[PDB]
Design a protein around this ligand. Structure first.
Ligand SMILES: [Zn+2]
Length: 500
C-alpha cells in the first residue's frame, strides 16, 4: 500500500505513424511498470493519444471523415503498436474522452478564477485576402502561400496563462529538489531556460479557426489549445478531483518523455500545477534521441531510419526490448541499428542464455533423469540472491542498461561455472556433485530469469517453462536460494532464441 508506482508516457499525436521514438519511450515505461509490479508495488502505467487541434482536424477533413470517427480509427495504430511491443499499460487515455474533457475545464476554471488567465492581444501576420492569420513558417518568402502577396500585421486576441509569474517559484523548487529533473544534464538545461523571463503562455485559439477542441468554460468562442488539454491527461486519467486513483498515484508521479518535449514538461507543466493548486510531480525522466546507424538524427530522407516493428517481426519483441534497454543509457543520444541488435541477440541472448538452457536441458536428461535435481546450497552462486537489492536503485535511477548488465554478468557467471565444473566429467565418480552443479545452474537461471522478466517477460516465461520452473514469479523470489523444485522438465522445448 505504501509501495506505489505511477509512470506516464507522453500522449502522442493521434494520427502519427508509430515509430522508434514512441516505441522506445513506451518500452522504458513498460519496463519500469513491470519491474515495480514484480517488486510488489501497487502500480499504474498510463499512456494515450493527443486528439484535438487544428492539425488533426485538417487530417480528418482530408480523409473525408468526421473528426471523432477519424480519431477513433487512427488512435488504433498506437494500440496495435503497443500490442506488438507487449506493452502492459493500465489505461490508455484519449483526450476526446468525457472524463478528460471534464478535468480540463475544471482546471481551466480553477486557474482562471485564481486570477492567472487573461485575454491578451498579440499581433500576428494576417492576409486580408484569405481573411486568416499565418505563422512565419507558413509564409512563402514572407508572402501568403495562397495569394503570393504580402501580409499585414494585425492583432489577434487569445487567452494567456500568467506563466512568468511562477518562474521564481519554479527556480526555487528545482533548486530545492535537485533530483526532480533527470538525468542531471537536463536539470541544468532547464535552469538555463529559467535564467531569463519565460513570458506568458498562449492557451487558446478562437473556435472559428480551431473548432476541434475543448471550449474554454468562460468563453465558448475559444477552444483550449494544446497545453491545458494534453498535459492534463496525467491527472484526468486518475479521476483527478477526488478519485481514489488520484489520491493514491499522483503523490508518486513519474513522467517519462523524450527531450523533444522537455520545456512543456519542465517549465509549462510545473507552473500550471502550481497555479491549479495541484502537487508537483515527483520526477521528470528525460530520454535522449535514438540516432540512426550513421550517428545522425533519424529521418526518412536521410535514409537512416530504424524500424522497431520490422525488427520486432524478425528477432521478436523480447530481443528488441532487451536491446533498447541494454544498449542505451537513458537520456543519452545513442545510435542504434539492426547490426547492433543482431550482435546483442546472438551473444547476450542466443549464446549466454539460449545455448546454456539447451546444454542444461540435455545434461538434465543425461545425468538427472530429465528432472531438476534435489536442491543444494549455492556456494559462489548463492550471491545471485543479492542482485535484486542492487538493481532496485539502478532501475529507479534510470540506469536500465547497468541493471541489465549486472543481471547478464551473473548469467555469464553461470556459463563459466558449468564450463569450469564440467558436470559431464564429474558424473562418473561423483554423480551427486554433478547433480549439485546442474541444480545451481538451474536455480541461478531461475533467479536471472526473474531479474530479466521486466525486459523480456515472454522469453523469460519461456525459459522458465523450458526448465520446468514455475512461470509466474515475484522479485522477492529471486532473493532466496533453493526455490527450484526437483520436477520433470518438458521432454521437448524450442531453442530459446533461434538463429536468424
Ligand atoms: Zn492569402
Amino acid at each position: 500500500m505504501e509501495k506505489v508506482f505511477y509512470v506516464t508516457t507522453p500522449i502522442y499525436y493521434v494520427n502519427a505513424e508509430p515509430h522508434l521514438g514512441h516505441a522506445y519511450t513506451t518500452v522504458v515505461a513498460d519496463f519500469l511498470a513491470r519491474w515495480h509490479r514484480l517488486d510488489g508495488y501497487r502500480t499504474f502505467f498510463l499512456t494515450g493519444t493527443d486528439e484535438h487541434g487544428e492539425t488533426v482536424y485538417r487530417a480528418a477533413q482530408a480523409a473525408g471523415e468526421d473528426p471523432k470517427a477519424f480519431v477513433d480509427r487512427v488512435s488504433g495504430r498506437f494500440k496495435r503498436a503497443w500490442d506488438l511491443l507487449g506493452i502492459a499499460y493500465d489505461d490508455f487515455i484519449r483526450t476526446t474522452e468525457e472524463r478528460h474533457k471534464k478535468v480540463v475545464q475544471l482546471v481551466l476554471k480553477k486557474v482562471y478564477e485564481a486570477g492567472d488567465i487573461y485575454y491578451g492581444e498579440y499581433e500576428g501576420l494576417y492576409c486580408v485576402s484569405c481573411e486568416r492569420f499565418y505563422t512565419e513558417k507558413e509564409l512563402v518568402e514572407g508572402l501568403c502561400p495562397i495569394h503570393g502577396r504580402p501580409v499585414e500585421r494585425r492583432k489577434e486576441g487569445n487567452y494567456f496563462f500568467r506563466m512568468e509569474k511562477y518562474r521564481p517559484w519554479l527556480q526555487e523548487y528545482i533548486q530545492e529538489n535537485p533530483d526532480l529533473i533527470r538525468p542531471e544534464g537536463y536539470r541544468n538545461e532547464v535552469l538555463a531556460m529559467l535564467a531569463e523571463p519565460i513570458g506568458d503562455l498562449s492557451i487558446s485559439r478562437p473556435k472559428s479557426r480551431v473548432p476541434w477542441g475543448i471550449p474554454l468554460p468562460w468563453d465558448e468562442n475559444h477552444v483550449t489549445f494544446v497545453w491545458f488539454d494534453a498535459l492534463l491527461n496525467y491527472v484526468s486519467a486518475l479521476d483527478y478531483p477526488e478519485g481514489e486513483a488520484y489520491r493514491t498515484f499522483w503523490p508518486h508521479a513519474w513522467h517519462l518523455i523524450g527531450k523533444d518535449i522537455l520545456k512543456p514538461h519542465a517549465v509549462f507543466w510545473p507552473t500550471m500545477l502550481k497555479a491549479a493548486g495541484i502537487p508537483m510531480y515527483r520526477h521528470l525522466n528525460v530520454g535522449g534521441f535514438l540516432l540512426g546507424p550513421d550517428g545522425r538524427k533519424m529521418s526518412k530522407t536521410l535514409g537512416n531510419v530504424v524500424d522497431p516493428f520490422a525488427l520486432l517481426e524478425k528477432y521478436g519483441r523480447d530481443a528488441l526490448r532487451y536491446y533498447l534497454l541494454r544498449e542505451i543509457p537513458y537520456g543519452q543520444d545513442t545510435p542504434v541499428s539492426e547490426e547492433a541488435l543482431r550482435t546483442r541477440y546472438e551473444a547476450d541472448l542466443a549464446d549466454d542464455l539460449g545455448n546454456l538452457v539447451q546444454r542444461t536441458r540435455a545434461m538434465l536428461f543425461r545425468f538427472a533423469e530429465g528432472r531438476i535435481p534435489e536442491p543444494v546450497a549455492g556456494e559462489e552462486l548463492a550471491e545471485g540472491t543479492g542482485l535484486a537489492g542492487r538493481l532496485r536503485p539502478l532501475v529507479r535511477e534510470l540506469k536500465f542498461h547497468v541493471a541489465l548488465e549486472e543481471a547478464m554478468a551473473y548469467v555469464k557467471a553461470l556459463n563459466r561455472y558449468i564450463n569450469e565444473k564440467k558436470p559431464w566429467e564429474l558424473f562418473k565418480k561423483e554423480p551427486e556433485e554433478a547433480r549439485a552443479v546442474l541444480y545451481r545452474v538451474v536455480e541461478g537461471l531461475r533467479i536471472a530469469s526473474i531479474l530479466l522478466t521486466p525486459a523480456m517477460p515472454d522469453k523469460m516465461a519461456e525459459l522458465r517453462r523450458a526448465l520446468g520452473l514455475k512461470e509466474e514469479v515475484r522479485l522477492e523470489e529471486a532473493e532466496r536460494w533453493g526455490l527450484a523444485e526437483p520436477r520433470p522438465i518438458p521432454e521437448e522445448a524450442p531453442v530459446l532464441f533461434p538463429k536468424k
